Design a protein around this ligand. Structure first.
Ligand SMILES: Cc1cc2nc3c(=O)[nH]c(=O)nc-3n(C[C@H](O)[C@H](O)[C@H](O)COP(=O)(O)OP(=O)(O)OC[C@H]3O[C@@H](n4cnc5c(N)ncnc54)[C@H](O)[C@@H]3O)c2cc1C
Ligand SMILES: Cc1cc2nc3c(=O)[nH]c(=O)nc-3n(C[C@H](O)[C@H](O)[C@H](O)COP(=O)(O)OP(=O)(O)OC[C@H]3O[C@@H](n4cnc5c(N)ncnc54)[C@H](O)[C@@H]3O)c2cc1C
Ligand SMILES: [Cl-]
Ligand SMILES: [Cu+2]
Ligand SMILES: [Cu+2]
Ligand SMILES: [Cu+2]
Ligand SMILES: [Cu+2]
Ligand SMILES: [Cu+2]
Ligand SMILES: [Cu+2]
Ligand SMILES: [Cu+2]
Ligand SMILES: [Cu+2]
Ligand SMILES: [Cu+2]
Ligand SMILES: [Cu+2]
Ligand SMILES: [Cu+2]
Ligand SMILES: [Cu+2]
Ligand SMILES: [Cu+2]
Ligand SMILES: [Cu+2]
Ligand SMILES: [Cu+2]
Ligand SMILES: [Cu+2]
Ligand SMILES: [Cu+2]
Ligand SMILES: [Cu+2]
Ligand SMILES: [Cu+2]
Ligand SMILES: [Cu+2]
Ligand SMILES: [Cu+2]
Ligand SMILES: [Cu+2]
Ligand SMILES: [Cu+2]
Ligand SMILES: [Cu+2]
Ligand SMILES: [Cu+2]
Ligand SMILES: [Cu+2]
Ligand SMILES: [Cu+2]
Lengths: 441, 440
C-alpha cells in the first residue's frame, strides 16, 4: 500500500515475534511470506514441530499413516493460529508473495496475478534456510528421493529408507523411522560417525541405532542415483543399494539467491549467508538479518535470541549483541535423545587443563527404568582448578529438559557441587545429576 | 559385634550413609526389618512401583501387564540395593526387626536368632507407616487395601473407591482412571486439595472428572462392610459399593516396635523422634534421618537428611535443615502438577506486592507434540524484588521444569533470567520463556 516503518521478509521465528512486538509498540509492520502453507515459520510446518510429533508417536510404535495425519492435525492447527496472531492486528499487513530487493528501501513481491512494490524505513531479512542438494547426478530426476519436507508427507511407511548424510537431522529420521518399523540405511561421507561428538558418545549412539535395525555406512561416496525396479537405487563404486525411499539430509544453506540481496548492497559469503555483525546489522543501513540467513547455528531458539537483540535496539533499554551467547545448548531427537552443552572430552583433554571426566550409565537411573528405556549414558567434564563444569553429554530420555539445568549453572559460573548437592524431584531425571556429580573425586 | 555405626532401616538416607561411612573406613551395620524391603520404601512400595504404573497408564496399557513390568523392576532395583551394600566388606546388612534396649546397644527380634548389637553411633531410619482411621469394619473387610496392597492386585477393578483426596489418592485416582477403571474419591473435607490454589485445584478436578473420577467432598464414611462381590462403604443414610477400596489417609512415622524410650530419645506426638537442625537426637550419639523426623515425606528430603549427617560426621563444619529453601513437590497424575514456593493466597497473605501470570498449556507447542495440551502454567512475581515467590506447573514433564524454577529461586535470581534464557526447542522448559514474558 504505502510506506512501512518495519518490513520483515519471512514468517520465521524471529520475524513473527518482532512483528507483534513492533505492532504492539505502534509500528506499521508488514510481514511478507512466499507460501500460504508456512505461516509460523520452518519450526512449525517443516522442522521442529512436525518431526518431533512423529518421533513421539514412533516411540510408542504407533501406526505410521495414523501418526502422519496426527502431524497434519497439529501443524494445520498451529499454522492457522500463527497466521491469525499477526493478521488480527491492525498494525500488521501479512502480504503473500516472494520478496526481492530493488533498493535498500524498495522490494518487489512476486504474486501470480501481479507484483507489488513495498517500501520500508527498516527492513528485516528473516527467510530461513533451504535444503542442500549434493552434486550427485540423478537426485532431481529420480522420483523416489525426498527432502526433509518431502519425507514428512509420505502416504504410508516405506520398508527400506535410505538417508543421504550422517548429520544430526539425518539421525533423527534414522531413529524415528526405525521406531516405525523400517530398515534405515544411513550414508555419511566421513570416516567417523558424528565427528563433532565424543567417540564414547558416538559409539553408544551407534549401538542404539544398530540394534533397532540401522546400519551405518561411513566414508561412502555415492556416484549416481536412479530407479531400476520401483526402488531408489543408490550406486557407489562396487557397492549398490536399493531403497523404497531416499531422504536428503546433507544440510541447510541460507536461502538468499531468490532474494537478490546484491541490489540493496547486502553482501553474502560463499554459502549465501548475509554478512552480519554482532548487532544483526548487514552492509546496508537500516536493514537487519535474523534467523538461518545469518549462516550461524540453525536453531529456533538461536533465531528467537536474534529477535531479542533486534528488539533491544529499536525499542530501547540499551543494546545487546551476539557476544552475549555462551554455552549454547542443543539436542538431537532420537530415542533416547542426546542433549549436549559445553565442551567434549576430546576438547577438554586437548586444552591441557586438569580435568576430571565422570560417567554414569543410564541403567543406574531408577526413573529411566520407570519409563522403560534404560539406554544411554551420562558424561560430564569438570575443571579441577576452578571446580566448574566445562561440558556435558546427556544421552537419556528427557535429556532436552535436563540440559537446561546444567546449562544454567555453567552460565552462572557455579561449581559442579551445585548440581551434586541439590534437592530435585522424585522420581525424575533431573535428580540423575545428583548421582552423576557424586562420582567426582 | 562392636560396630562404629548402626543404621536401622534400608531407607534412602541410611542406604547412602552406610555406603558413605564404609568408604571412610567405618564398621557399618544396617539392620533391615523385611526381606522384601531392600532399597527402602521408595524402591519397593513408594515412588518407583507407583509411577512405573503411571507411565504405563498414560499409554492405556493392559493393567495386568503393567503390574508384571512393575514386579520385574522392583525385583531388579531390590537386588541391586543389596549388592551395593554387600559389595562393601565393611557393611553387614543384618535382617531382623530391631529394638532398643539402651542407648549404646540394640536387640533385633529375628527368627534365625534373637541377637543384641552394640553401636558407637545409631542412625534411626525406620521410615513411616500407613495408619488407618478407626472406621468400623475397616478391620476385617475383604477388598480393602492401602497403597501397598493395591499395588499387587490381580486384575483391574471395575469401580475403585478412594478414602482420601490427598496427593497419594490423586495419583492412584488418575492412574486407575487411565486403565479404564471408574474411580470414586471420598474426601472428608469441604475442599479439593486444600493446600493448593483455588485456580489449580479446579483444573485438576476438571481433568479428573473428565476421566470419570467423582470427587465427593464432605463424605461421611461411617462404616465399611462386604456384601455381594463388592466392598460397601456405609454413608449418610445410604451406602455405596465399589469393587476395591484404597486407603489414602497419610502415613505416620514408624517408631513403635523400636521401643525407643530405652535409648532415651524424646518422641513427640505422632511418634516422630524430636530432632534439631543437624538431625541430632536427645541421645548424644543417635541420629534420625528420613520420615521418622516428622518432616516432609519425600525421598529427596531423606537424601538431604543424609547430607546433613554426612556433613556432621565427616564434613567440615555443620550444615542444617535451615538451608532447605523452596522444597518442591510433584503429584504424578496425568498431567503432573509440580509446585515450588508459595501460592497466590500465601503470597497475598504475606503482604507483598505480587503479580500473577498464567499461560494455558494449549499455547505450548511442545504439549501438542506430546499429545497432552491439558493443564495450566502459573507463577508469581514480586514487584518489589523482581523475584519469583512460587510457581504452579500443571503440565506434562512438569516434574522436570520445576527444578529449573527452584534453582533460580535458590540462587535467588530475578524472573527476567528465565524469561530471556535460551532454552532447547522443542521442549517443555522453554515455556518459561513465554510464561515470564507476561510480567509487566
Ligand atoms: C528437518 C528440520 C528439523 C529441525 N529440528 C529442529 C529442532 O529439533 N530444534 C531446533 O531448535 N531447530 C530445529 N530446526 C531448525 C529450525 O526449524 C529453524 O532453524 C528455525 O525455524 C529458524 O527459522 P528462521 O527464523 O530462520 O526462519 P524460517 O522459519 O526458517 O523461514 C523464514 C520464512 O521466510 C520465507 N521465505 C524464504 N525465502 C523468501 C523469499 N525470497 N521471500 C519471502 N519469504 C521468503 C520462508 O518461506 C519462511 O516461511 C529444524 C530444521 C529442519 C529443516
Ligand atoms: C505410595 C507412595 C508414594 C510415594 N511417592 C513419592 C513421590 O512421588 N516422591 C517422593 O519424594 N516421595 C514419595 N513417597 C515417599 C517416599 O517413598 C518415602 O517418604 C521415603 O522413601 C522415606 O525414606 P526414609 O529415609 O524415611 O527411609 P524408608 O525407606 O522409609 O525406611 C523404611 C525402612 O525401614 C525398615 N524398618 C522399619 N522399622 C524397622 C525396624 N524396627 N527394624 C528394622 N528395619 C525397620 C522398613 O522395613 C523399611 O525397609 C511415596 C510414598 C508412598 C508410600
Ligand atoms: Cl545436519
Ligand atoms: Cu515456535
Ligand atoms: Cu520399544
Ligand atoms: Cu483461519
Ligand atoms: Cu534512506
Ligand atoms: Cu538429475
Ligand atoms: Cu532392504
Ligand atoms: Cu563423486
Ligand atoms: Cu519410473
Ligand atoms: Cu573398479
Ligand atoms: Cu531471481
Ligand atoms: Cu551498524
Ligand atoms: Cu559455546
Ligand atoms: Cu514412554
Ligand atoms: Cu533410589
Ligand atoms: Cu489418553
Ligand atoms: Cu558389582
Ligand atoms: Cu556413652
Ligand atoms: Cu518372638
Ligand atoms: Cu555384648
Ligand atoms: Cu460402581
Ligand atoms: Cu451431614
Ligand atoms: Cu443380598
Ligand atoms: Cu437423617
Ligand atoms: Cu446404611
Ligand atoms: Cu515389641
Ligand atoms: Cu549437636
Ligand atoms: Cu507421550
Amino acid at each position: 500500500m504505502n510506506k512501512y516503518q518495519a518490513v520483515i521478509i519471512g514468517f520465521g521465528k524471529a520475524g513473527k515475534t518482532l512483528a507483534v512486538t513492533l505492532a504492539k509498540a505502534g509500528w506499521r509492520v508488514a510481514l511478507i511470506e512466499q507460501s500460504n502453507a508456512m505461516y509460523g515459520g520452518t519450526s512449525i510446518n517443516i522442522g521442529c514441530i512436525p518431526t518431533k510429533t512423529l518421533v513421539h508417536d514412533a516411540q510408542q510404535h504407533t501406526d505410521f499413516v495414523r501418526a502422519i495425519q496426527r502431524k497434519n492435525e497439529v501443524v494445520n492447527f498451529l499454522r492457522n493460529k500463527n497466521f491469525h496472531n499477526l493478521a488480527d492486528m491492525p498494525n500488521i499487513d501479512v502480504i503473500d508473495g516472494q520478496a526481492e530487493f530493488i533498493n535498500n528501501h524498495s522490494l518487489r513481491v512476486h504474486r501470480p496475478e501481479g507484483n507489488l512494490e513495498i517500501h520500508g524505513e527498516k527492513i528485516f531479512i528473516n527467510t530461513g534456510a533451504q535444503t542442500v542438494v549434493p552434486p550427485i547426478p540423478g537426485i532431481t530426476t529420480t522420483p523416489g528421493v525426498y527432502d526433509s519436507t518431502g519425507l514428512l508427507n509420505l502416504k504410508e511407511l516405506p520398508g527400506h529408507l535410505g538417508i543421504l548424510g550422517g548429520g544430526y537431522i539425518g539421525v533423527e529420521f534414522a531413529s524415528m523411522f526405525a521406531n516405525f518399523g523400517s530398515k534405515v540405511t544411513i550414508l555419511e561421507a566421513a570416516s567417523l560417525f558424528l565427528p563433532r561428538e565424543d567417540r564414547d558418545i558416538a559409539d553408544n549412539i551407534a549401538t542404539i541405532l544398530r540394534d533397532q535395525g540401522v546400519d551405518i555406512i561411513l566414508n561412502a561416496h555415492v556416484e549416481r542415483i536412479s530407479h531400476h525396479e520401483n526402488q531408489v537405487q543408490v550406486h557407489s563404486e562396487h557397492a549398490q543399494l536399493a531403497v523404497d525411499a531416499l531422504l536428503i539430509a546433507s544440510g541447510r544453506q541460507p536461502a538468499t539467491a531468490s532474494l537478490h540481496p546484491e541490489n540493496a548492497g547486502i553482501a553474502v559469503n560463499e554459502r549465501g549467508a548475509t554478512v552480519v555483525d554482532k548487532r544483526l546489522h548487514t552492509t546496508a543501513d537500516n536493514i537487519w538479518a535474523m534467523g538461518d540467513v545469518t549462516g550461524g547455528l540453525q536453531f529456533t531458539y538461536i533465531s528467537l535470541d536474534d529477535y531479542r537483540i533486534v528488539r533491544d535496539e529499536l525499542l530501547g533499554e540499551g543494546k545487546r549483541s551476539t557476544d552475549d551467547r555462551k554455552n549454547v545448548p542443543y539436542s538431537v531427537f532420537m530415542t533416547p535423545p542426546l542433549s549436549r552443552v559445553g565442551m567434549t572430552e576430546e576438547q577438554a583433554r586437548e586444552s591441557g587443563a586438569d580435568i576430571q571426566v565422570v560417567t554414569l550409565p543410564v541403567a543406574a537411573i531408577p526413573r529411566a527404568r520407570v519409563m522403560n528405556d534404560t539406554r544411554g549414558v551420562l558424561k560430564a567434564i569438570v575443571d579441577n582448578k576452578t571446580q566448574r563444569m566445562l561440558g556435558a553429554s546427556l544421552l537419556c530420555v528427557d535429556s532436552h529438559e535436563m540440559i537446561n539445568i546444567v546449562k544454567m549453572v555453567m552460565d552462572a559460573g557455579l561449581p559442579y557441587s551445585i548440581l551434586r548437592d541439590q534437592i530435585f524431584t522424585h522420581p525424575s531425571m533431573s535428580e540423575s545429576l545428583n548421582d552423576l556429580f557424586s562420582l567426582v573425586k
